[PDB]
Amino acid sequence: KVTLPDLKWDFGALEPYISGQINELHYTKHHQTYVNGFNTAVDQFQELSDLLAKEPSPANARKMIAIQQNIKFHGGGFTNHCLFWENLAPESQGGGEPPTGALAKAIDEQFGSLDELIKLTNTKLAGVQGSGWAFIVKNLSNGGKLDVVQTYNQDTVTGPLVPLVAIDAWEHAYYLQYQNKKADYFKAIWNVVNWKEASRRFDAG
Amino acid sequence: KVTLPDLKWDFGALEPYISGQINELHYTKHHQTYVNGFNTAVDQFQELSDLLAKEPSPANARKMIAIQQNIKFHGGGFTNHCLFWENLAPESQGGGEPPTGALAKAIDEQFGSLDELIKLTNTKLAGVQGSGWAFIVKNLSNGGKLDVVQTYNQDTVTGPLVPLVAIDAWEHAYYLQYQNKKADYFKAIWNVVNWKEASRRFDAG
Amino acid sequence: KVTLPDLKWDFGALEPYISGQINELHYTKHHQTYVNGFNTAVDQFQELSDLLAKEPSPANARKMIAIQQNIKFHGGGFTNHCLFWENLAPESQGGGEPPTGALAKAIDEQFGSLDELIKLTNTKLAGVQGSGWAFIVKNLSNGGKLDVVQTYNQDTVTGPLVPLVAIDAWEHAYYLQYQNKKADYFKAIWNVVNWKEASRRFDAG
Amino acid sequence: KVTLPDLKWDFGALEPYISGQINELHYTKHHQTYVNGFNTAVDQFQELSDLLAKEPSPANARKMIAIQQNIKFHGGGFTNHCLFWENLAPESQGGGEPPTGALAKAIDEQFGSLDELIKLTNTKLAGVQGSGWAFIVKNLSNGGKLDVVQTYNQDTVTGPLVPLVAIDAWEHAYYLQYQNKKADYFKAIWNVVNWKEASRRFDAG
Numbered sequence: 060k061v062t063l064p065d066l067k068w069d070f071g072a073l074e075p076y077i078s079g080q081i082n083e084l085h086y087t088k089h090h091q092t093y094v095n096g097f098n099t100a101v102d103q104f105q106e107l108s109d110l111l112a113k114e115p116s117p118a119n120a121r122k123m124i125a126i127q128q129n130i131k132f133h134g135g136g137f138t139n140h141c142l143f144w145e146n147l148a149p150e151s152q153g154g155g156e157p158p159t160g161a162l163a164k165a166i167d168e169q170f171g172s173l174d175e176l177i178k179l180t181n182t183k184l185a186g187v188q189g190s191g192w193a194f195i196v197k198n199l200s201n202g203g204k205l206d207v208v209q210t211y212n213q214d215t216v217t218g219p220l221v222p223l224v225a226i227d228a229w230e231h232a233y234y235l236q237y238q239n240k241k242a243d244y245f246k247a248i249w250n251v252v253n254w255k256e257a258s259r260r261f262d263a264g
Numbered sequence: 265k266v267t268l269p270d271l272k273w274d275f276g277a278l279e280p281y282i283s284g285q286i287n288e289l290h291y292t293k294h295h296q297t298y299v300n301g302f303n304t305a306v307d308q309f310q311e312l313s314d315l316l317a318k319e320p321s322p323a324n325a326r327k328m329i330a331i332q333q334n335i336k337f338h339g340g341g342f343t344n345h346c347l348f349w350e351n352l353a354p355e356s357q358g359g360g361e362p363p364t365g366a367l368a369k370a371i372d373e374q375f376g377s378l379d380e381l382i383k384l385t386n387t388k389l390a391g392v393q394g395s396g397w398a399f400i401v402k403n404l405s406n407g408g409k410l411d412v413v414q415t416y417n418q419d420t421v422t423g424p425l426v427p428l429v430a431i432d433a434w435e436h437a438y439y440l441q442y443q444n445k446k447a448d449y450f451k452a453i454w455n456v457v458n459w460k461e462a463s464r465r466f467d468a469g
Numbered sequence: 470k471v472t473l474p475d476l477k478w479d480f481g482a483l484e485p486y487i488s489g490q491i492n493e494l495h496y497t498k499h500h501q502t503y504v505n506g507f508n509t510a511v512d513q514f515q516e517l518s519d520l521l522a523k524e525p526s527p528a529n530a531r532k533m534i535a536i537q538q539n540i541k542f543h544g545g546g547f548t549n550h551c552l553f554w555e556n557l558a559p560e561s562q563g564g565g566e567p568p569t570g571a572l573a574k575a576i577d578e579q580f581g582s583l584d585e586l587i588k589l590t591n592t593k594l595a596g597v598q599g600s601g602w603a604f605i606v607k608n609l610s611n612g613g614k615l616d617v618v619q620t621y622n623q624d625t626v627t628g629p630l631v632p633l634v635a636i637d638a639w640e641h642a643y644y645l646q647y648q649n650k651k652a653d654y655f656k657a658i659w660n661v662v663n664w665k666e667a668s669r670r671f672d673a674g
Numbered sequence: 675k676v677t678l679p680d681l682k683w684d685f686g687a688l689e690p691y692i693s694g695q696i697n698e699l700h701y702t703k704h705h706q707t708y709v710n711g712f713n714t715a716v717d718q719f720q721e722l723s724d725l726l727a728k729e730p731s732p733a734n735a736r737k738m739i740a741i742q743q744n745i746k747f748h749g750g751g752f753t754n755h756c757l758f759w760e761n762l763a764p765e766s767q768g769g770g771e772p773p774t775g776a777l778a779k780a781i782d783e784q785f786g787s788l789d790e791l792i793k794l795t796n797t798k799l800a801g802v803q804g805s806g807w808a809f810i811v812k813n814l815s816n817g818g819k820l821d822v823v824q825t826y827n828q829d830t831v832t833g834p835l836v837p838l839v840a841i842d843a844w845e846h847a848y849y850l851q852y853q854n855k856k857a858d859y860f861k862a863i864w865n866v867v868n869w870k871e872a873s874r875r876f877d878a879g
């Protein structure tokens with residue numbers, strides 16, 4: 060069923076900001092594990108669904124409840140990393156270039172400048188007390204306004220919050236290169252953020 | 265698919281400990297809503313499963329993630345209330361009579377007496393800071409030892425924790441009769457707890 | 470230390486939308502319990518602070534960790550209900566009258582109309598799967614934009630999210646009058662929401 | 675106020691199971707940050723306490739609520755890592771030697787063997803979906819029975835759960851050596867677990 064996506068850059072294309080060593084593990088091992096876990100979880104739930112169809116008991120319901128956590132976690136890991144690679148690019152492919160169009164206008168109007176939005180996001184990233192993510196989002200329910208939200212583990216933004224830029228704050232995203240110095244990673248990553256993709260996501264809603 | 269279970273007592277059979285007014289609403293309205301929500305949630309997930317089978321995208325994954333919370337919540341509400349009615353009985357049907365067999369032995373060995381186990385459980389119930397449940401459980405992974413655990417909302421015990429007695433701490437479980445005096449409800453309910461059923465659950469594992 | 474605030478209306482002043490019976494219990498019992506718990510929690514933490522000052526052990530730290538949950542919960546219950554009464558008013562005191570000034574402008578620009586903002590908030594209230602709150606907020610970090618957020622239990626909005634209108638979704642807020650029909654309560658309460666106060670909160674930031 | 679504890683082994687004393695490189699960062703950087711954050715958090719709360727003493731407002735309460743998360747997180751990080759080093763030892767100091775006394779008896783009676791308890795704990799560690807910990811505990815409320823519990827982030831065991839062995843599952847605990855292969859780390863660490871200390875903790879309760 061679900062598979063790893065293809066990359067638009069080889070593993071070392073984001074150096075010196077993110078190492079090829081990190082990207083290789085992050086994609087081939089971490090992302091793949093979420094792919095596998097999500098495939099497995101949805102399979103198990105199909106099976107339990109059929110079991111419940113013939114025997115709709117509290118006992119059968121309990122097992123379904125048990126599996127929904129793995130659907131959430133692995134589904135989240137699958138989708139978050141897909142967002143992540145797609146909002147990263149080498150400088151040679153426009154990584155680090157500022158956003159355009161309606162997204163650029165909204166950023167200036169709401170935050171004053173891109174740098175102010177990046178500062179806010181770095182504060183949110185440093186504030187993740189555990190594993191998690193920060194997302195720059197477009198909120199479709201309050202007039203399409205930008206915000207920045209944190210999630211923990213592989214929780215994600217759904218429904219009316221549209222993700223524009225995802226930034227991974229799990230330690231595996233930086234530890235081999237930056238070790239404990241997560242703030243240096245949060246600072247560096249903007250040099251390869253694909254704001255063209257964020258602008259397209261803002262438009263597509 | 266899932267339906268409300270039948271009751272072994274008419275709504276007013278647990279008076280003066282739980283009113284007929286409460287039982288009527290709790291069963292016909294609250295439990296039914298969880299039945300409906302669980303049926304609806306599993307349906308939506310079957311649909312999304314088929315959508316993912318043909319198009320395994322991060323976008324399609326996001327929608328599945330979104331629905332798993334309703335599967336957990338409504339599935340939990342369905343199963344918890346099923347446990348609840350089945351561990352309640354009027355005095356005329358042995359409600360309030362102490363447990364028997366291997367459960368009775370474990371209670372005395374671990375807690376000293378039933379009253380001590382009830383005290384602990386009432387402390388756990390009063391400590392639910394929000395809506396939730398206390399469950400007396402048998403833990404299959406540590407040698408079958410008894411414990412008491414709290415859950416919030418419609419979260420439940422799964423896997424190696426076997427529920428023996430479920431006690432509802434949501435305000436709808438008591439408010440019409442006891443209003444804010446939840447401790448009076450926690451005290452009263454033991455008079456109609458079906459420890460015969462708890463003993464059977466302990467044996468069945 | 471902290472005490473219950475005074476009310477700007479007698480308990481029955483919000484009828485037929487919220488009963489005097491509910492307001493009496495909600496204020497004299499529920500709010501008072503949070504007042505007491507918050508006072509007690511901060512006292513215990515002062516004591517533990519002094520203990521740690523003389524003996525900064527992991528053991529002493531563990532006890533402080535244990536008490537911070539009661540500070541959060543009771544502190545939240547204290548502050549949320551204070552917000553709540555202050556954003557409610559009888560019709561004779563302007564309850565139900567639409568907001569004014571910069572808040573009114575922001576609502577129309579972001580949501581199209583007050584009714585649309587109320588609809589969104591009612592969706593958020595019905596979506597609280599357990600006990601909790603919805604808050605209409607002003608977000609100071611994204612240019613002062615309005616949003617609506619849910620919290621569970623007595624969790625609250627802090628820091629850059631300024632609460633403008635708080636709506637209690639705990640069952641004790643409605644059960645005596647509406648029982649399970651929470652949607653009827655969410656619909657009715659807007660008739661006595663004090664939008665003058667929300668407008669002042671929006672300005673004061 | 676709180677400070678880093680002294681180690682009973684130099685950083686490389688747990689090789690080849692945990693590298694000196696990891697221990698150096700884990701102690702000097704990670705643990706120190708929690709020390710600093712806990713000191714800072716308790717200071718801020720003392721200040722807010724005094725502010726509330728003179729002005730017990732919902733506004734002042736909101737700020738205290740805001741700080742309790744940092745007390746929990748950093749307090750937890752401080753205490754968890756203190757537990758951690760104290761339950762690790764080089765083989766030359768008895769690391770890896772089985773527990774003794776009443777703890778050894780309880781393990782055999784409840785789990786059948788130490789290996790079975792270790793297997794269960796490794797399952798719990800691999801099941802932490804994010805950052806967190808597994809703790810082998812003695813539960814004082816159910817007759818002193820052993821169990822294994824998971825926590826997330828720097829959440830900890832408090833009150834009636836006595837921690838006997840703490841095992842860190844944050845990625846920084848293993849990533850430099852094992853990278854994604856967390857199961858290899860969970861397997862290896864038992865070779866340097868200080869079961870003498872766990873046995874003393876079991877006795878001291």
Ligand SMILES: [Fe+3]
Pocket residue numbers: 085089140227229231232
């Ligand atoms: Fe990642």
Ligand SMILES: [Fe+3]
Pocket residue numbers: 290294345432434436437
């Ligand atoms: Fe219920």
Ligand SMILES: [Fe+3]
Pocket residue numbers: 495499550637639641642
């Ligand atoms: Fe309330």
Ligand SMILES: [Fe+3]
Pocket residue numbers: 700704755842844846847
């Ligand atoms: Fe650690």
